[PDB]
Amino acid sequence: DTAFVEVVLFESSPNGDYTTYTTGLQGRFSRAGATISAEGEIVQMHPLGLCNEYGWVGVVKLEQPELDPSCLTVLGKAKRAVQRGATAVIFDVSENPDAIDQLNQVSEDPLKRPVVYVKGADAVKLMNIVNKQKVARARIQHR
């Protein structure tokens, strides 16, 4: 059930030195996807792109439905990311609890990549890194 996510942020200096920062956070593998390990560069998926290269980890921050005018269901968003070559997708479900119920419905034919959700302090930590818009990678593991 539990998904352990390691996030690494890369920052380069003009002189060519680089720094990294790694932190850990926890989520859950949803039944909509696989419970396997995955790792890749983080790409945030915003609404316009969802409604319009490979191995990236997609991050989707769900908003309240009234503020998240969408073309897709939460499942449909996961499917689209996997279609477009994501190795995994992580939903921040902080502002939309119901998405958890939708992702956990027993699928006859679940996605073959992990579909993880985070919330609370773990989601805050993730989004604080994602919003910096630098190079960052996520590793997802089940223990």
UniProtKB/Swiss-Prot annotation:
Spans within the Extracellular topological domain: 1-143
Location in the cell: Cell membrane
Job of this protein: E3 ubiquitin-protein ligase that acts as a negative regulator of the Wnt signaling pathway by mediating the ubiquitination and subsequent degradation of Wnt receptor complex components. Along with RSPO2 and RNF43, constitutes a master switch that governs limb specification.
Family: Belongs to the ZNRF3 family.
Protein's name in the database: E3 ubiquitin-protein ligase znrf3
Organism encoding this protein: Danio rerio
Annotated gene: znrf3
Residues of the full protein shown: 31 to 181 of 868
